[PDB]
């Protein structure tokens, strides 16, 4: 027929890997993001933005190389190669920190393309698109942190860097400055992640330990036709075991798998809300009543006050080198410290 | 250090404090204290809870 | 010390949904009993 | 006016009731300390 029909027929054939209409968005963006990270962790430095060395060419290894955020003087610039900051001249663009923006901007559209690809394949094979929501979870996490947190802060400088040790720096930084462990949203995220791991392990063990004897060899792996009608394992025995050991057990096979899908996505979506809140400095930092009582009574002490003191130490001893553009100068007599060491 | 609800703690900040540093790794059952008050002052319940729980 | 409105917030936000869910379950059970002919209608 | 043919019935078994009660109580336990401040 028309050209549209021919292109549609070609895009949805059965070849090496599915392409689809979403491939046009998915492939170039993801390829460019991965290539940018690989070429940034190998040749590009961070001397002029953070004062650090972050490449193999300088001497770092896999655990210390990273692609660093742009300089603080560029607040929220899109950092286009043709923009008024670089004006072409690839070298200056690399030196000021344009690769971070390149990677993030292309990677976001790569993620969008992957979600659209999941939709398209699910429609093609005629099944419900339950994978799309499960992937929408991580999309929320990435969007929330990597874009909304810097946009509410001073500049792109306060975003996570694409490296192994840079992420550890980010974790310690948010603990020190935001008291992120006391927030009731990272708590629900932790609960979701640990519950997901628990469910995976327990379901695997339970299914593998209730198999029906359908063979003669101790190698139970080669006793499963690629697909038949009869169930592999015994649901009644599993229900009896888990109801006599724990007190309650699953009995419906669809509810089990829906629960497995539901838990971790809920955890990620709950934690994203807390990160969005932190973006505006709307912290959950202090318990006012305990602070008042400790102020008026110099004998009240809990673990909460200990954590507060640890946070103060982190801030005071990290700010000087963590933000080189502020020219912080702290004499030895001013840094808070305990006895002896 | 205070760790109970009745002494000015909430659910988040409350805890059961570990035993004293002066004890070290020494066994500290109830009958080895001069009084129950001394047992509670030196963080006695922590050892009991952890041992019976691990078993 | 503590905020007084927290008492009202916690108690109301805990008690109302509990009664809502209990009502849902009890009306479901009552409809089930009514459908099957018996001594309790 | 008249009898509507779109009328249906709601349902909630005991397992869902237990799940809802647990969720509400746990949420209250988690957020009470922060509400009291």
């Amino acid at each position: 027929r028309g050209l549209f029909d021919l292109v549609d027929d070609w895009l949805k054939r059965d070849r090496f890997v599915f392409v689809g209409w979403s491939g046009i968005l998915l492939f170039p963006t993801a390829y460019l993001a991965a290539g940018g990270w690989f070429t940034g962790t190998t040749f590009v430095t961070s001397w002029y933005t953070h004062g650090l060395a972050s490449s193999y060419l300088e001497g770092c290894n896999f655990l210390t190389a990273a692609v660093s955020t742009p300089a603080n003087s560029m607040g929220h610039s899109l950092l286009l190669l043709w923009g008024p900051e670089a004006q072409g001249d690839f070298t200056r663009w690399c030196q000021i920190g344009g690769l971070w923006a390149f990677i993030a901007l292309h990677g976001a559209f790569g993620l969008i393309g992957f979600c659209l690809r999941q939709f398209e394949i699910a429609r093609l094979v005629g099944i419900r698109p339950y994978n799309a929501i499960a992937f929408s979870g991580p999309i929320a996490v990435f969007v929330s942190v990597f874009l909304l947190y810097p946009l509410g802060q001073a500049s792109w400088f306060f975003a996570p860097s694409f490296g192994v040790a840079a992420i550890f720096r980010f974790l310690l930084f948010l603990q020190g400055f935001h008291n992120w462990t006391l927030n009731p949203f990272h708590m629900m995220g932790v609960a979701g992640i640990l519950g997901g791991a628990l469910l995976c392990a327990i379901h695997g063990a339970t299914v593998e330990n209730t198999l029906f004897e359908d063979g003669d060899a101790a190698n139970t792996f080669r006793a499963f036709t690629p697909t038949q009608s009869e169930e592999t394992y015994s649901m009644v025995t599993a229900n009896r075991f888990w109801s006599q050991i724990f007190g309650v057990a699953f009995s419906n096979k669809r509810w089990l798998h829906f629960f497995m899908l539901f838990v971790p996505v809920a955890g990620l979506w709950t934690s994203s809300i807390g990160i969005v809140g932190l973006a505006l400095n709307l912290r959950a930092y202090d318990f006012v009543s305990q602070e008042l009582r400790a102020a008026e009574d110099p004998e009240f002490e809990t673990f909460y006050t200990k954590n507060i003191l640890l946070n103060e130490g982190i801030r005071s001893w990290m700010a000087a080198q963590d933000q080189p553009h502020e020219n912080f100068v702290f004499p030895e007599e001013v840094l808070p410290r305990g006895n002896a060491l | 250090v205070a760790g109970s609800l009745l002494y000015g703690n909430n659910i988040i900040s409350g805890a059961v404090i570990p035993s004293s540093n002066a004890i070290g790794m020494h066994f500290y059952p109830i009958w080895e204290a001069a009084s129950v008050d001394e047992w509670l002052y030196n963080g006695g319940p922590y050892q009991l809870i952890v041992l019976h729980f691990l078993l | 010390e503590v905020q007084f409105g927290a008492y009202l917030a916690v108690l109301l936000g805990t008690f109302l949904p509990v009664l809502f869910l209990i009502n849902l379950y009890i009306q479901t059970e009552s409809r089930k009993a009514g459908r099957d002919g018996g001594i309790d209608s | 006016t008249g009898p509507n043919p779109n009328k249906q019935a709601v349902e909630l078994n005991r397992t869902s009731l237990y799940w809802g009660l647990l969720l509400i109580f746990v949420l209250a336990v988690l957020f009470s300390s922060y509400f009291f401040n």
Binding site: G247, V248, S251 | L6 | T14 | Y18, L22
Partner: peptide, 28 residues
């Protein structure tokens, strides 16, 4: 006075768990 609220919430959760375990819908 909030210790009463904390204790009530914890004991209520334990009661819910007890009823869930011992008064449960038969799997059959």
């Amino acid at each position: 006075m909030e210790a009463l609220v904390y204790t009530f919430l914890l004991i209520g959760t334990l009661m819910v768990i007890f009823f869930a375990v011992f008064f449960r819908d038969t799997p059959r």
